[PDB]
Design a protein around this ligand. Structure first.
Ligand SMILES: [Mg+2]
Ligand SMILES: [Mg+2]
Ligand SMILES: [Mg+2]
Ligand SMILES: [Mg+2]
Ligand SMILES: [Mg+2]
Ligand SMILES: [Mg+2]
Ligand SMILES: [Mg+2]
Ligand SMILES: [Mg+2]
Ligand SMILES: [Mg+2]
Ligand SMILES: [Mg+2]
Ligand SMILES: [Mg+2]
Ligand SMILES: [Mg+2]
Ligand SMILES: [Mg+2]
Ligand SMILES: [Mg+2]
Ligand SMILES: [Mg+2]
Ligand SMILES: [Mg+2]
Ligand SMILES: [Mg+2]
Ligand SMILES: [Mg+2]
Ligand SMILES: [Mg+2]
Ligand SMILES: [Mg+2]
Ligand SMILES: [Mg+2]
Ligand SMILES: [Mg+2]
Ligand SMILES: [Mg+2]
Ligand SMILES: [Mg+2]
Ligand SMILES: [Mg+2]
Ligand SMILES: [Mg+2]
Ligand SMILES: [Mg+2]
Ligand SMILES: [Mg+2]
Ligand SMILES: [Mg+2]
Ligand SMILES: [Mg+2]
Ligand SMILES: [Mg+2]
Ligand SMILES: [Mg+2]
Ligand SMILES: [Mg+2]
Ligand SMILES: [Mg+2]
Ligand SMILES: [Mg+2]
Ligand SMILES: [Mg+2]
Ligand SMILES: [Mg+2]
Ligand SMILES: [Mg+2]
Ligand SMILES: [Mg+2]
Ligand SMILES: [Mg+2]
Ligand SMILES: [Mg+2]
Ligand SMILES: [Mg+2]
Ligand SMILES: [Mg+2]
Ligand SMILES: [Mg+2]
Ligand SMILES: [Mg+2]
Ligand SMILES: [Mg+2]
Ligand SMILES: [Mg+2]
Ligand SMILES: [Mg+2]
Ligand SMILES: [Mg+2]
Ligand SMILES: [Mg+2]
Ligand SMILES: [Mg+2]
Ligand SMILES: [Mg+2]
Ligand SMILES: [Mg+2]
Ligand SMILES: [Mg+2]
Ligand SMILES: [Mg+2]
Ligand SMILES: [Mg+2]
Ligand SMILES: [Mg+2]
Ligand SMILES: [Mg+2]
Ligand SMILES: [Mg+2]
Ligand SMILES: [Mg+2]
Ligand SMILES: [Mg+2]
Ligand SMILES: [Mg+2]
Ligand SMILES: [Mg+2]
Ligand SMILES: [Mg+2]
Ligand SMILES: [Mg+2]
Ligand SMILES: [Mg+2]
Ligand SMILES: [Mg+2]
Ligand SMILES: [Mg+2]
Ligand SMILES: [Mg+2]
Ligand SMILES: [Mg+2]
Ligand SMILES: [Mg+2]
Ligand SMILES: [Mg+2]
Ligand SMILES: [Mg+2]
Ligand SMILES: [Mg+2]
Ligand SMILES: [Mg+2]
Ligand SMILES: [Mg+2]
Ligand SMILES: [Mg+2]
Ligand SMILES: [Mg+2]
Ligand SMILES: [Mg+2]
Ligand SMILES: [Mg+2]
Ligand SMILES: [Mg+2]
Ligand SMILES: [Mg+2]
Ligand SMILES: [Mg+2]
Ligand SMILES: [Mg+2]
Ligand SMILES: [Mg+2]
Ligand SMILES: [Mg+2]
Ligand SMILES: [Mg+2]
Ligand SMILES: [Mg+2]
Ligand SMILES: [Mg+2]
Ligand SMILES: [Mg+2]
Ligand SMILES: [Mg+2]
Ligand SMILES: [Mg+2]
Ligand SMILES: [Mg+2]
Ligand SMILES: [Mg+2]
Ligand SMILES: [Mg+2]
Ligand SMILES: [Mg+2]
Ligand SMILES: [Mg+2]
Ligand SMILES: [Mg+2]
Ligand SMILES: [Mg+2]
Ligand SMILES: [Mg+2]
Ligand SMILES: [Mg+2]
Ligand SMILES: [Mg+2]
Ligand SMILES: [Mg+2]
Ligand SMILES: [Mg+2]
Ligand SMILES: [Mg+2]
Ligand SMILES: [Mg+2]
Ligand SMILES: [Mg+2]
Ligand SMILES: [Mg+2]
Ligand SMILES: [Mg+2]
Ligand SMILES: [Mg+2]
Ligand SMILES: [Mg+2]
Ligand SMILES: [Mg+2]
Ligand SMILES: [Mg+2]
Ligand SMILES: [Mg+2]
Ligand SMILES: [Mg+2]
Ligand SMILES: [Mg+2]
Ligand SMILES: [Mg+2]
Ligand SMILES: [Mg+2]
Ligand SMILES: [Mg+2]
Ligand SMILES: [Mg+2]
Ligand SMILES: [Mg+2]
Ligand SMILES: [Mg+2]
Ligand SMILES: [Mg+2]
Ligand SMILES: [Mg+2]
Ligand SMILES: [Mg+2]
Ligand SMILES: [Mg+2]
Ligand SMILES: [Mg+2]
Ligand SMILES: [Mg+2]
Ligand SMILES: [Mg+2]
Ligand SMILES: [Mg+2]
Ligand SMILES: [Mg+2]
Ligand SMILES: [Mg+2]
Ligand SMILES: [Mg+2]
Ligand SMILES: [Mg+2]
Ligand SMILES: [Mg+2]
Ligand SMILES: [Mg+2]
Ligand SMILES: [Mg+2]
Ligand SMILES: [Mg+2]
Ligand SMILES: [Mg+2]
Ligand SMILES: [Mg+2]
Ligand SMILES: [Mg+2]
Ligand SMILES: [Mg+2]
Ligand SMILES: [Mg+2]
Ligand SMILES: [Mg+2]
Ligand SMILES: [Mg+2]
Ligand SMILES: [Mg+2]
Ligand SMILES: [Mg+2]
Ligand SMILES: [Mg+2]
Ligand SMILES: [Mg+2]
Ligand SMILES: [Mg+2]
Ligand SMILES: [Mg+2]
Ligand SMILES: [Mg+2]
Ligand SMILES: [Mg+2]
Ligand SMILES: [Mg+2]
Ligand SMILES: [Mg+2]
Ligand SMILES: [Mg+2]
Ligand SMILES: [Mg+2]
Ligand SMILES: [Mg+2]
Ligand SMILES: [Mg+2]
Ligand SMILES: [Mg+2]
Ligand SMILES: [Mg+2]
Ligand SMILES: [Mg+2]
Ligand SMILES: [Mg+2]
Ligand SMILES: [Mg+2]
Ligand SMILES: [Mg+2]
Ligand SMILES: [Mg+2]
Ligand SMILES: [Mg+2]
Ligand SMILES: [Mg+2]
Ligand SMILES: [Mg+2]
Ligand SMILES: [Mg+2]
Ligand SMILES: [Mg+2]
Ligand SMILES: [Mg+2]
Ligand SMILES: [Mg+2]
Ligand SMILES: [Mg+2]
Ligand SMILES: [Mg+2]
Ligand SMILES: [Mg+2]
Ligand SMILES: [Mg+2]
Ligand SMILES: [Mg+2]
Ligand SMILES: [Mg+2]
Ligand SMILES: [Mg+2]
Ligand SMILES: [Mg+2]
Ligand SMILES: [Mg+2]
Ligand SMILES: [Mg+2]
Ligand SMILES: [Mg+2]
Ligand SMILES: [Mg+2]
Ligand SMILES: [Mg+2]
Ligand SMILES: [Mg+2]
Ligand SMILES: [Mg+2]
Ligand SMILES: [Mg+2]
Ligand SMILES: [Mg+2]
Ligand SMILES: [Mg+2]
Ligand SMILES: [Mg+2]
Ligand SMILES: [Mg+2]
Ligand SMILES: [Mg+2]
Ligand SMILES: [Mg+2]
Ligand SMILES: [Mg+2]
Ligand SMILES: [Mg+2]
Ligand SMILES: [Mg+2]
Ligand SMILES: [Mg+2]
Ligand SMILES: [Mg+2]
Ligand SMILES: [Mg+2]
Ligand SMILES: [Mg+2]
Ligand SMILES: [Mg+2]
Ligand SMILES: [Mg+2]
Ligand SMILES: [Mg+2]
Ligand SMILES: [Mg+2]
Ligand SMILES: [Mg+2]
Ligand SMILES: [Mg+2]
Ligand SMILES: [Mg+2]
Ligand SMILES: [Mg+2]
Ligand SMILES: [Mg+2]
Ligand SMILES: [Mg+2]
Ligand SMILES: [Mg+2]
Ligand SMILES: [Mg+2]
Ligand SMILES: [Mg+2]
Ligand SMILES: [Mg+2]
Ligand SMILES: [Mg+2]
Ligand SMILES: [Mg+2]
Ligand SMILES: [Mg+2]
Ligand SMILES: [Mg+2]
Ligand SMILES: [Mg+2]
Ligand SMILES: [Mg+2]
Ligand SMILES: [Mg+2]
Ligand SMILES: [Mg+2]
Ligand SMILES: [Mg+2]
Ligand SMILES: [Mg+2]
Ligand SMILES: [Mg+2]
Ligand SMILES: [Mg+2]
Ligand SMILES: [Mg+2]
Ligand SMILES: [Mg+2]
Ligand SMILES: [Mg+2]
Ligand SMILES: [Mg+2]
Ligand SMILES: [Mg+2]
Ligand SMILES: [Mg+2]
Ligand SMILES: [Mg+2]
Ligand SMILES: [Mg+2]
Ligand SMILES: [Mg+2]
Ligand SMILES: [Mg+2]
Ligand SMILES: [Mg+2]
Ligand SMILES: [Mg+2]
Ligand SMILES: [Mg+2]
Ligand SMILES: [Mg+2]
Ligand SMILES: [Mg+2]
Ligand SMILES: [Mg+2]
Ligand SMILES: [Mg+2]
Ligand SMILES: [Mg+2]
Ligand SMILES: [Mg+2]
Ligand SMILES: [Mg+2]
Ligand SMILES: [Mg+2]
Ligand SMILES: [Mg+2]
Ligand SMILES: [Mg+2]
Ligand SMILES: [Mg+2]
Lengths: 76, 134, 76
RNA sequence: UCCCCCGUGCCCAUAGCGGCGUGGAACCACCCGUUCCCAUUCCGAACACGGAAGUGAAACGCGCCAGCGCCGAUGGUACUGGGCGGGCGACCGCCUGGGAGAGUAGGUCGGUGCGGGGG
RNA sequence: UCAACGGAUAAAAGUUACCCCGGGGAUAACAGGCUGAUCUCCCCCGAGCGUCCACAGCGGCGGGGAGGUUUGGCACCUCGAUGUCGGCUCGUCGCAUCCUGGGGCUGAAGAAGGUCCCAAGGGUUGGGCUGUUCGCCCAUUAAAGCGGCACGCGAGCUGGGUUCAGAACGUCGUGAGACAGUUCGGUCUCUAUCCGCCACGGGCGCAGGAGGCUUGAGGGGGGCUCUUCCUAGUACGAGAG
RNA sequence: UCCUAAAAGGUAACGGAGGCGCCCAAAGGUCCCCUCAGGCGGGACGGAAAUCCGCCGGAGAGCGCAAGGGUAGAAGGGGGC
RNA sequence: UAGCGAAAUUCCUUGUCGGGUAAGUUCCGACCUGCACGAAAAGCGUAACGACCGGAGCGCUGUCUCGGCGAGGGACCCGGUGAAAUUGAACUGGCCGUGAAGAUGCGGCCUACCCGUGGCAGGACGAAAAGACCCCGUGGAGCUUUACUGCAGCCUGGUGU
RNA sequence: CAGGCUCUGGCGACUGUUUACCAAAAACACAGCUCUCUGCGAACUCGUAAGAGGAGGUAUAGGGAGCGACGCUUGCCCGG
RNA sequence: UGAAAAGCUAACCGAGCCCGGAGAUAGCUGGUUCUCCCCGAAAUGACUUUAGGGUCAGCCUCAGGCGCUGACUGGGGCCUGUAGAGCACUGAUAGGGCUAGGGGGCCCACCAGCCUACCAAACCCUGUCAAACUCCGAAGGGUCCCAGGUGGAGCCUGGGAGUGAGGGCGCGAGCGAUAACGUCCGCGUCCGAGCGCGGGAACAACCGAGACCGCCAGCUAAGGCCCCCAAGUCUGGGCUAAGUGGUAAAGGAUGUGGCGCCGCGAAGACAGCCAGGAGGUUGGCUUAGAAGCAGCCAUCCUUUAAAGAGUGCGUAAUAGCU
RNA sequence: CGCGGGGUGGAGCAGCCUGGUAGCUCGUCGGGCUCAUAACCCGAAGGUCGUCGGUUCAAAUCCGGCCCCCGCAACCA
RNA sequence: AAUGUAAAAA
RNA sequence: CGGAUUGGGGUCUGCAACCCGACCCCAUGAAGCCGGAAUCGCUAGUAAUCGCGGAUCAGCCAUGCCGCGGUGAAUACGUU
RNA sequence: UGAAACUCAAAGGAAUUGACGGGGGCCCGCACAAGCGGUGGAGCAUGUGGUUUAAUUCGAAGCAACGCGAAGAACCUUACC
């Protein structure tokens, strides 16, 4: 009875939460599409991954119709 | 009907949404106890009701069977039951309004709505219509 | 008109179970899988003990008693 | 300090849809033309250039309206971490902390930051 | 298509009833158990049928449950073995009662019967066919009940069937072989230790020793039935009965 | 790919459903431009549905293929290099 | 095809019809929808032969209704000699529970003075045999082939003699 | 001391043979039929070989195969 | 070797016996011996000709190093799509409104129209369902920061392992039949290894509790206090009459107790009991028949203080009795 | 309960793999030869591709489910 | 390159 | 070319031209491009071809019939 | 070697006349051959089959029925309705 299939879990989601120090360029969120958009010092790769471009702390922000953004508020 | 395929069992926790109030009709029948009511069970009550007051008023049916009923043909363990043997059922939780009668006298609603209660796997109750609305 | 299925009504026929015959080893011994449906209204009967399942045998006998009983009533 | 308009950002429908009224003096639109820069899979529609005359019609700014959209309590219940009791069960009840969705009352035709022209 | 996708060789299919060893109750077949879908019985509702009339008798559509005889699900004791069908012997228990006993209702005149309720005491035949259980049949009966006891009973018996080795038919397979398909053949173990049981003794006891004769607490056995005659050819019935 | 999976991640069964073993020199990079589906009305052949004009129409289209997530403030359609 | 056919082949199947019988899932005759006869793994038939397998009748009988009596050799008792398998240890009862789901051994209840002899086979999941069935082991072995690979044997070109 | 008989089916023609110790048969064998190989230092078998059997035989003979007295008969198909 | 059974070849032949290779190999079974002391697992995951075997990880333990970081907890910040609920997307859905297409009649041939106690898209209101639907959405969980927290806590290197059959219970799901001492995951827990101790008659895992040894001391836990059997025949207020308690369901019934609402009655109720209980009527319709009284449709007035176009029986149909 | 094959004008078969167009034979209908019918000759018509659903621009043809026909299979106890 | 039944002779 | 069909207007017979006459004029202008299998006629003033008349009868659905003349061929090896 | 039941009113010989022959011989006719034109296609006219109708009056049936009775059907005719 054909059905025993499935794919292996991809383990994705936010990796670093709001108010968390981050090193140069470590990943912050792995997402299916654009559940989140870039931000201050926060670029995104082919798989829509979101990673830091600088050190400092991560902060989230909901911009309604705009989207949900995530960025690093640096310091040094 | 259409939907898709076979469906998991799921439990029948507290009769929260399991219930309502009398919508149409002069009287109705409420479930005191949770259960899966079969298609057959339903029609059983219906045809009963009509048969009682021939050429009668109007019977409403507030419940409706859409859960697929799986079952195995006397075997063991490969795959999920081809099911559908009793066919389909309706999730009736304590409180739900199942049948409304209208256009008849009490002694008719009482009797008919009672006879129907004899086809249902459940303890039941017949309501007037108090007034509680919205 | 017609009359067929009305006859398969239970109270009319009589179904007996019993140990099978021939091969089966200890299975055939302590497992009764022989089935015989007699159609009391006409006495006509069929008996079956091919498979190992009493249920699959009762199923078959019935399905053949039908056809025989159907021809009798058809001739009539 | 104030008011009008212009460009820009912010909160992201209480800002929106529609209805009605309103301003061209400055601003903005439309308007005149297409020589030139440039442009249409065809059309100066659009983008682009030169430029008075006309106009506030369209667009837009402003304001009033709730009919639609949008926001929307309170009380109360569902459910529920943690603790305990009951029915064979399908299940149900109590204590302690948490507590919606729906619907109701009601709110809304926005608010505000910077810069520039205009009295 | 190392696709058996972490890929054993560069390079590989069957068969064994002629079979064998190591292991497993970690896992099937028997039985028990749990479960009770299937099974057997009972019940609620009452459309409808029965001239009229829902229960004399019956019951659509659907609902609740009992029992643990069948089919099945699971895999829990048992694979340093719990022998499996049928018959035979001996039984014993249940009661959902086949007969005899008692009773209500009856669409019970009588006789006879229908159906429900009470009721195990005892009873529940002989033969043909088949390994059979089951069933059909012959001739009877008061009746020819159902079921539990490892589908009671192989340290009691049998061994027809079923499960070894031989041989064959059909039949599948190139084949060796194979088949809840058939067919003929085929090795059932003198000694009972304990419990239990059937009998029979020895000992001591029964607060004097002795011979004889009883009491009956407790227990056990048995508890079946038909036919004809009288009452009376009466009641009953048009009569036949 | 989705569900089961109990709002982190994970998570089983011979549980419920469906795909993959490719394709594209443009279906790729960039610069500029552009915005659907669909509904009503008007239109010669057409005709429920070609193409044309109007209005309404925030994403129900589209994104080579399954499904989901995303998405017109482009990832969608066109062009130049 | 001939022939044969519910068959040493027929699942349905006790097929249907006829014979035999009081009554016949068998037997025998017949028909033919042959699951799935069939012509040298021969087809059909056949006198005789067979400790082969089936059906029937006569005869005769303890095979049986259904048992009884009787004889000898055991078994029993006394004298002589005197084993065996088995054996955790025992001071080893019934019911209803119970427990790993079949209890002398736990629970409750009931019954029971101690020890033997003759006799029975219900239990001790009784003895015996590290289950033959079944599965497991990247265990073994016998066998087959158009499984793989190899060898004998054979055939064959070249060459030596 | 010393046969119970009769009728009627199946299998096998028949006397024989066999699973020493669970199978005596419808199993094997058999006379007989057919196919096929073999010209003789035969073919075939045993052996590395020499050699031996075949046979001191010669196609009415010898090896292999199947069927299995006897009677009647034994059809069609040469794609693999 | 075999007139063939794989028969026989020195009492067991699908390849004899002896000896040797030999201590073949055996991911299998069995067995493995003195004492005391501290700690103490696992029956998961990934891969595996792997599944009753292994390799790595996880969990145990020892040695050396690190020093408040650990569990748990308070505050704060972010992530989440569940229970619930909802119907705005995808679908499902009962009734009605409205309205394309279809069905069927009158009316037609020029094609048109009008009906429709029919079928039905779209749309609307009413009402509802959904694991793989979500406009919405908790308790809670997860992680970072800050603080409490010195514990057989935590971290780092390294020596030694065992374990990779798990089991029951509570809860949350799938499978199953809302069966199973069933199965398969998740969270927890106890047995495993606590078959040690008290309770539950007895009984791994249910309730109580973590046994270092001794005591003819003491308090309590669950449970229990009439006797077997420790301790109250304790006190007060109810209920139950079945031995219910001592463990079964729809469904049933003037069992008994308690609360509540309705109506009747001293202008006389409920019961019983005496009288009428009527008239067109024989209601109309069907039916062989249908007289309140089979089946179908239904709502008059008159005598009166009163009597239904009728409650139940009954006759063929009446009357009847009520 | 499994696995494999198939449902196409009135009959029997093709087409489907590798989607655009449904072909062959008999039969049917019209006409002719014959005295007439058969044969023979000339011309023509006829198919919802089992049904429901999907993928596609497009389905007999591809994918999923139900229904019917055929072939195998159903062992150890 | 086949076949045409079945009631006609004062 | 061919003149069918249809519209429109009109004459004449006959009591009467809807069904149903014949003709005229305008307009409309059809299939048909030489015909499948098959099949008819004719041997010389014949076929082919082209007109004229008559019977009938109000008129005429006559392209029909009976008769008349005008122009005027082809080809018959042979009897399978 | 050799019946019967049953059943038929014949079976049958030779010869005669005739018809027939995918027998023969001799012989003929627009019979074929040679040759010219034509129906079968189209339109219309006309008769007939069939169906239809209130009735569509009836007869004629291969050759030798089908522009044939009909050398004149609007009503007359006309037998039909
Ligand atoms: Mg899976
Ligand atoms: Mg996934
Ligand atoms: Mg997974
Ligand atoms: Mg997943
Ligand atoms: Mg159910
Ligand atoms: Mg099984
Ligand atoms: Mg009303
Ligand atoms: Mg009312
Ligand atoms: Mg009920
Ligand atoms: Mg009920
Ligand atoms: Mg009720
Ligand atoms: Mg309300
Ligand atoms: Mg019935
Ligand atoms: Mg047998
Ligand atoms: Mg066998
Ligand atoms: Mg076997
Ligand atoms: Mg069994
Ligand atoms: Mg059994
Ligand atoms: Mg069988
Ligand atoms: Mg079978
Ligand atoms: Mg009859
Ligand atoms: Mg100032
Ligand atoms: Mg200032
Ligand atoms: Mg700002
Ligand atoms: Mg102006
Ligand atoms: Mg101008
Ligand atoms: Mg220009
Ligand atoms: Mg110029
Ligand atoms: Mg210039
Ligand atoms: Mg310039
Ligand atoms: Mg430009
Ligand atoms: Mg251009
Ligand atoms: Mg210029
Ligand atoms: Mg102005
Ligand atoms: Mg304006
Ligand atoms: Mg504006
Ligand atoms: Mg709200
Ligand atoms: Mg609130
Ligand atoms: Mg709570
Ligand atoms: Mg809680
Ligand atoms: Mg508490
Ligand atoms: Mg409980
Ligand atoms: Mg709210
Ligand atoms: Mg609302
Ligand atoms: Mg507004
Ligand atoms: Mg506005
Ligand atoms: Mg300013
Ligand atoms: Mg592998
Ligand atoms: Mg491989
Ligand atoms: Mg084998
Ligand atoms: Mg064998
Ligand atoms: Mg054998
Ligand atoms: Mg053998
Ligand atoms: Mg061996
Ligand atoms: Mg062994
Ligand atoms: Mg087990
Ligand atoms: Mg039960
Ligand atoms: Mg039942
Ligand atoms: Mg009952
Ligand atoms: Mg009822
Ligand atoms: Mg009733
Ligand atoms: Mg009736
Ligand atoms: Mg019914
Ligand atoms: Mg029934
Ligand atoms: Mg039921
Ligand atoms: Mg039930
Ligand atoms: Mg298990
Ligand atoms: Mg043992
Ligand atoms: Mg034993
Ligand atoms: Mg009695
Ligand atoms: Mg009587
Ligand atoms: Mg037998
Ligand atoms: Mg008997
Ligand atoms: Mg049993
Ligand atoms: Mg049993
Ligand atoms: Mg037994
Ligand atoms: Mg024995
Ligand atoms: Mg026995
Ligand atoms: Mg026995
Ligand atoms: Mg024997
Ligand atoms: Mg036998
Ligand atoms: Mg035997
Ligand atoms: Mg053997
Ligand atoms: Mg073969
Ligand atoms: Mg079989
Ligand atoms: Mg036998
Ligand atoms: Mg013998
Ligand atoms: Mg002896
Ligand atoms: Mg003995
Ligand atoms: Mg003595
Ligand atoms: Mg004594
Ligand atoms: Mg006594
Ligand atoms: Mg007694
Ligand atoms: Mg007398
Ligand atoms: Mg008398
Ligand atoms: Mg007398
Ligand atoms: Mg009398
Ligand atoms: Mg008499
Ligand atoms: Mg008498
Ligand atoms: Mg996922
Ligand atoms: Mg999750
Ligand atoms: Mg998920
Ligand atoms: Mg949770
Ligand atoms: Mg979670
Ligand atoms: Mg869930
Ligand atoms: Mg999640
Ligand atoms: Mg599932
Ligand atoms: Mg590749
Ligand atoms: Mg390009
Ligand atoms: Mg419009
Ligand atoms: Mg148009
Ligand atoms: Mg169009
Ligand atoms: Mg259009
Ligand atoms: Mg969107
Ligand atoms: Mg997801
Ligand atoms: Mg998508
Ligand atoms: Mg999407
Ligand atoms: Mg782009
Ligand atoms: Mg034949
Ligand atoms: Mg027979
Ligand atoms: Mg035979
Ligand atoms: Mg028979
Ligand atoms: Mg007979
Ligand atoms: Mg058959
Ligand atoms: Mg054959
Ligand atoms: Mg042969
Ligand atoms: Mg033979
Ligand atoms: Mg013979
Ligand atoms: Mg013999
Ligand atoms: Mg002999
Ligand atoms: Mg004799
Ligand atoms: Mg005799
Ligand atoms: Mg003696
Ligand atoms: Mg003696
Ligand atoms: Mg002795
Ligand atoms: Mg004793
Ligand atoms: Mg004992
Ligand atoms: Mg104890
Ligand atoms: Mg003794
Ligand atoms: Mg002695
Ligand atoms: Mg014993
Ligand atoms: Mg013992
Ligand atoms: Mg024993
Ligand atoms: Mg073993
Ligand atoms: Mg292997
Ligand atoms: Mg080997
Ligand atoms: Mg080869
Ligand atoms: Mg070969
Ligand atoms: Mg080689
Ligand atoms: Mg060579
Ligand atoms: Mg050579
Ligand atoms: Mg003698
Ligand atoms: Mg003799
Ligand atoms: Mg004799
Ligand atoms: Mg012999
Ligand atoms: Mg023979
Ligand atoms: Mg001899
Ligand atoms: Mg010999
Ligand atoms: Mg011998
Ligand atoms: Mg031996
Ligand atoms: Mg032997
Ligand atoms: Mg012998
Ligand atoms: Mg032999
Ligand atoms: Mg010979
Ligand atoms: Mg011969
Ligand atoms: Mg030769
Ligand atoms: Mg050799
Ligand atoms: Mg050699
Ligand atoms: Mg020699
Ligand atoms: Mg042959
Ligand atoms: Mg032939
Ligand atoms: Mg061949
Ligand atoms: Mg050849
Ligand atoms: Mg060849
Ligand atoms: Mg021997
Ligand atoms: Mg020896
Ligand atoms: Mg021996
Ligand atoms: Mg041997
Ligand atoms: Mg060997
Ligand atoms: Mg060794
Ligand atoms: Mg190993
Ligand atoms: Mg410790
Ligand atoms: Mg493992
Ligand atoms: Mg420190
Ligand atoms: Mg915290
Ligand atoms: Mg919705
Ligand atoms: Mg709806
Ligand atoms: Mg319509
Ligand atoms: Mg219509
Ligand atoms: Mg109408
Ligand atoms: Mg309509
Ligand atoms: Mg609206
Ligand atoms: Mg609504
Ligand atoms: Mg609304
Ligand atoms: Mg959401
Ligand atoms: Mg909302
Ligand atoms: Mg909200
Ligand atoms: Mg801290
Ligand atoms: Mg595991
Ligand atoms: Mg587990
Ligand atoms: Mg469970
Ligand atoms: Mg204990
Ligand atoms: Mg217990
Ligand atoms: Mg324990
Ligand atoms: Mg315990
Ligand atoms: Mg104290
Ligand atoms: Mg206490
Ligand atoms: Mg008290
Ligand atoms: Mg008290
Ligand atoms: Mg009790
Ligand atoms: Mg009640
Ligand atoms: Mg009452
Ligand atoms: Mg009256
Ligand atoms: Mg009357
Ligand atoms: Mg009256
Ligand atoms: Mg009456
Ligand atoms: Mg009377
Ligand atoms: Mg009457
Ligand atoms: Mg009366
Ligand atoms: Mg086909
Ligand atoms: Mg198909
Ligand atoms: Mg087919
Ligand atoms: Mg097809
Ligand atoms: Mg067909
Ligand atoms: Mg057809
Ligand atoms: Mg196909
Ligand atoms: Mg004809
Ligand atoms: Mg034609
Ligand atoms: Mg043709
Ligand atoms: Mg198809
Ligand atoms: Mg097509
Ligand atoms: Mg088979
Ligand atoms: Mg076996
Ligand atoms: Mg086998
Ligand atoms: Mg003929
Ligand atoms: Mg004929
Ligand atoms: Mg004739
Ligand atoms: Mg004029
Ligand atoms: Mg031309
Ligand atoms: Mg004239
Ligand atoms: Mg003329
Ligand atoms: Mg005769
Ligand atoms: Mg001629
Ligand atoms: Mg001539
Ligand atoms: Mg000619
Ligand atoms: Mg022509
Ligand atoms: Mg023509
Ligand atoms: Mg004609
Ligand atoms: Mg007509
Ligand atoms: Mg005449
Ligand atoms: Mg005529
Ligand atoms: Mg004429």
């Amino acid at each position: 009875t054909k059905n025993g299939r499935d794919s292996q879990a991809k383990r994705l989601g936010v990796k670093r939460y709001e108010g968390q120090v981050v090193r140069a360029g470590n990943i912050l969120v792995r997402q299916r599409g654009t559940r989140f958009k870039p931000g201050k010092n926060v670029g995104m790769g082919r798989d829509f991954t979101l990673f830091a471009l600088v050190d400092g702390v991560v902060e989230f922000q909901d911009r309604g119709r705009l989207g949900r953004y995530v960025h690093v508020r640096p310091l040094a | 009907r259409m939907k898709y395929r076979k469906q998991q069992r799921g439990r029948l926790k507290g009769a929260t949404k399991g219930g309502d109030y009398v919508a149409f009709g002069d009287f109705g029948l409420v479930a005191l106890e949770p259960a899966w009511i079969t298609a057959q069970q339903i029609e059983a009550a219906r045809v009963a009701m009509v048969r009682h007051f021939r050429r009668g008023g109007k019977i409403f049916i507030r419940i409706f069977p859409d859960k697929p009923y799986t079952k195995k043909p006397l075997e063991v363990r490969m795959g999920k039951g081809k099911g559908n043997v009793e066919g389909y059922v309706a999730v009736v939780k304590p409180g739900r309004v199942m049948f409304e009668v209208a256009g008849v006298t009490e002694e008719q609603a009482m009797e008919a709505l009672r006879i129907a209660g004899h086809k249902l796997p459940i303890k039941t109750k017949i309501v007037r219509r108090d007034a509680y609305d919205e | 008109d017609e009359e067929v299925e009305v006859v398969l009504k239970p109270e009319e026929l009589r179904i007996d179970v019993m140990r099978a015959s021939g091969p089966g080893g200890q299975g055939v011994n302590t497992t009764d899988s022989a089935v015989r449906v007699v159609h009391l209204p006409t006495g006509i009967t069929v008996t079956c003990q091919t498979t190992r399942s009493q249920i699959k045998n009762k199923e078959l006998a019935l399905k053949i008693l039908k056809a025989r009983l159907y021809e009798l009533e058809r001739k009539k």
